[PDB]
A paper describes a structure:
Genomic DNA adenine methylation within 5’-GANTC-3’ sequences (N = any nucleotide) is an epigenetic mark that controls gene expression in alpha-proteobacteria. Like the mammalian DNA cytosine methyltransferase (MTase) Dnmt12, which is essential for maintenance methylation of hemimethylated CpG dinucleotides at DNA replication forks, the DNA adenine MTase (Dam) in Escherichia coli and cell cycle-regulated DNA MTase (CcrM) in Caulobacter crescentus are responsible for maintenance methylation of GATC or GANTC immediately after replication, respectively. Here, by means of X-ray crystallography, we show that a CcrM dimer binds DNA by opening up double stranded DNA at the recognition site, a DNA recognition mechanism that likely contributes to the enzyme’s sequence discrimination. Each molecule comprises an N-terminal MTase domain (residues 1–260) of an 8-stranded β-sheet (β1-β8) with three helices (αA, αB, αC, and αE, αF, αG) located on each side of the sheet, resulting in an open αβα sandwich.
We used an 18-base-pair oligonucleotide (plus a 5’-overhanging cytosine on one strand and a guanine on the other strand) containing a non-centrally located GAATC site for co-crystallization with CcrM. We crystallized the CcrM-DNA complex in the presence of sinefungin (a methyl donor analog) in space group P212121 and determined the structure to the resolution of 2.34 Å. The DNA-bound form of CcrM contains two molecules (A and B). The dimer interface with an area of ~3100 Å2 is mainly mediated by the MTase domains with two active sites (indicated by the binding of sinefungin) facing opposite directions. The MTase domain of molecule A (in cyan) makes most of the contacts to the target strand (in magenta) and catalyzes methyl transfer, while the C-terminal domain of molecule B (in green) is solely responsible for the binding of the non-target strand (in yellow). The CcrM-bound DNA molecule undergoes dramatic distortions at the 5-bp recognition site while the outer sequences at both ends maintain B-form. Subsequently, four out of the five base pairs within the recognition sequence are disrupted (A2:T2 to C5:G5), with the four bases of the target strand (A2 to C5) being repositioned into new locations and being completely out-of-stacking with neighboring bases. In molecule A, the 30-residue Loop-2B approaches DNA from the major groove with the tip of the loop, Pro45, wedging in-between the two thymine bases T2 and T3, causing a kink in the non-target strand and displacing thymine T2 to the border of the double helix. In accordance with the most common mechanism for guanine recognition, Arg44 forms bidentate hydrogen bonds with the O6 and N7 atoms of the G1 base.
Numbering used by the authors:
A (entry chain A): 1 to 260, 268 to 357
B (entry chain B): 3 to 38, 62 to 356
The structure:
DNA sequence: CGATTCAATGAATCCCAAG
DNA sequence: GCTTGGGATTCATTGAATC
């Protein structure tokens, strides 16, 4: 009953949370199974198989079975949460809307939805959808009548900080050395979250010494980040082999003192989308002997051939490479000007 | 249907008046709160989505956009009513409004949901190659960076104030329409507002049907859409998918004369050789079949594209047989 | 050694036209 | 509607293998 700074519990999160005292934790971070509902095998363009999340703990018979599970552990989570505490839940489109409805139905007050913008997600291989390049976190206090939840706005110096105050966080996947390897040399856990995501949650909505509960502990990512930042934690996980890796990982964590951005692309298609050029407009060269027509997707046409400003600009000169930004010009009131001016105009607004 | 249709009234009553399976795409920006209780909003949400699904064609899709206040309500009703989510989209606002209150994170995004009408109707419009071109030749992702609707695009009312509190940017609808419709498709917007969907639809050569209950918003929408310069249809072409090129069976390459029975095909390294058959099959020793089944068998692969795998001898060296398919398509 | 080329992989609801 | 099989499809990053 008298826990230490690190507590790892083997069992089902509903049963184990119900055994904890009520109003006992300052923050809850939940990474529940998403119930991806995958049909079958997916192959990369080189015919190699994707190691998909097909584990038994992500299989649910239906939406209704997932909703009953969701409302059950959320109710147990709300019981052990302190009155001035908060909960974080993460998901993708497969589940985050069902989690969010259950969060609101149980009396939580959603303060923000936070987007985890993945810099290096697995792409869409067949060309059937947009690349699923993000996940969604929900940050909610225990009630809208709650006294005062924790939000370290003045401590983190977030006043007018254009990157900290944003509700979208650009963070890479958990790969490389941080990705814990199992006994077979492969990944130990299929859905391990990057520690950098947990750092932003912990440092913004907890104080040193606070108790963080993770009812889906996995390989102990919440615990490793809490211990490194001077927070106490309680982890619950059903799988014993994940807990073996979590215990060995956390024992190697050295607590630090917590007080201790790539260039974005500007596609030509964005300039046409913004209306700075219209589809059907004409692009000229420096002299005006070569012309191209703008298409709605940022491609351009010369004769019967179409393509990007760089491929077509290279074809119109019979040259290997070409920088279409400096080669193509658009008519203004003062004559021809390179489309690179419009690229700098959109770039300055980003 | 008509290129431009604007209807004054309630979206549930009006959508029920339309014929079934008549619209290709639905874009919905519902109000956050119901009347200017979650139970009331959930019933309203379930009613207009159910009415929208009936009007949608079997191969159509729906877009909804909201904030954290209501998007979970809408997302659950979308899934529950039989829609199948393809993506949720994050509109990252390039220039978000600053939040100096210091109590929450600054609202720098909104969420969109793109879903086909049902799960097993997997034929839906998605112009993958056009959007890849639009994203500098890397495939378009679920995170979109688009500025807020500001400047002269923000429709002003009398006395100079903003006319609509939740007017969406045209560039956002431009990417929606560019990606999930074709020229000629009809787009239904049951929450028209000041006509953002219509202005973008008219620009890209799409029909639209707008429904809005406030007459003051419809006067602004009509005047705004009238000033939209429509792009000529010959300028609405985008990059196409190779899945829609005229199929040239390999049996036609042999019957034409570009390859003869007895010719040998090679892999990239030249270690896998196959002989051409009269009917278009190829043989590797005792194995015989199509250029795709044999190409996969000779390298122990589940699948293979024989057009890029097999090569025929030319004056410059090994050239893929896809070169010969291009010659047939050139004529 | 450094520079250049391969190989691997990540929460994924991932084909579609012809008969 | 179903089945069949042609043939289309990948981004960022890490770390080893090769030159
Ligand atoms: N009912 C349950 N009680 C406890 N743990 C569960 C239960 N159901 C699923 N789990 C586990 O929850 C974990 C879900 C993971 N997404 C968590 C990974 C964790 N965030 C990490 O970074 O390592 C899986 O390891 C499941 O085994
Ligand atoms: N029941 C209803 N039927 C039709 N329109 C409604 C209804 N309820 C609210 N509306 C309107 O729907 C609009 C919701 C807006 N968010 C849409 C704005 C629109 N996307 C724009 O860019 O202008 C508001 O103008 C509402 O007045």
């Amino acid at each position: 009953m008298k826990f230490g700074p690190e507590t790892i519990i083997h069992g089902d999160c509903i049963e184990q949370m119900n055994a904890l005292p009520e109003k006992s934790v300052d923050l809850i971070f939940a990474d529940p199974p998403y119930n991806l509902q995958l049909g079958g095998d997916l192959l990369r363009p080189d015919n190699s198989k994707v190691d998909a999340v097909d584990d038994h703990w992500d299989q649910f018979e239906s939406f209704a079975a997932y909703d009953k599970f969701t409302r059950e552990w959320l109710k147990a989570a709300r019981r052990v949460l302190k009155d001035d505490g908060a909960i974080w839940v993460i998901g993708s489109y497969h589940n985050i809307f069902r989690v969010g409805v259950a969060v609101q139905d149980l009396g939580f007050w959603i303060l923000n939805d936070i987007v985890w913008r993945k810099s290096n997600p697995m792409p869409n291989f067949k060309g059937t959808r947009f690349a699923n390049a993000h996940e969604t976190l929900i940050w909610a206090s225990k009630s809208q009548n709650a006294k005062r939840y924790t939000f370290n706005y003045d401590a983190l110096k977030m006043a007018n900080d254009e990157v900290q105050m944003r509700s979208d966080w650009t963070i890479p996947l958990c790969t490389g050395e941080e990705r814990i390897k199992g006994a077979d040399g492969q990944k130990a856990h299929p859905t391990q979250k990057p520690e950098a995501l947990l750092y932003r949650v912990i440092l913004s909505t907890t104080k040193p010494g606070d108790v963080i509960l993770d009812p889906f502990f996995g390989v102990g990512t919440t615990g490793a980040a809490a211990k490194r930042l001077g927070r106490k934690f309680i982890g619950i996980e059903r799988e014993a082999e994940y807990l073996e890796h979590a215990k060995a990982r956390i024992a190697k964590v050295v607590p630090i003192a917590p007080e201790d951005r790539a260039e974005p692309r500007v596609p030509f298609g964005t300039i046409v989308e913004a209306g700075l050029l219209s589809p059907g407009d004409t692009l000229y060269c420096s002299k005006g002997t070569h012309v191209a027509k703008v298409r709605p997707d940022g491609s351009i046409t010369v004769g019967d051939l179409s393509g990007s400003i760089h491929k077509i600009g290279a074809l119109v000169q019979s040259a290997p490479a070409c920088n279409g930004w400096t080669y193509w010009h658009f008519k203004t009131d003062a004559g021809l000007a390179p489309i690179d001016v419009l690229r700098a105009q959109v770039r300055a607004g980003m």
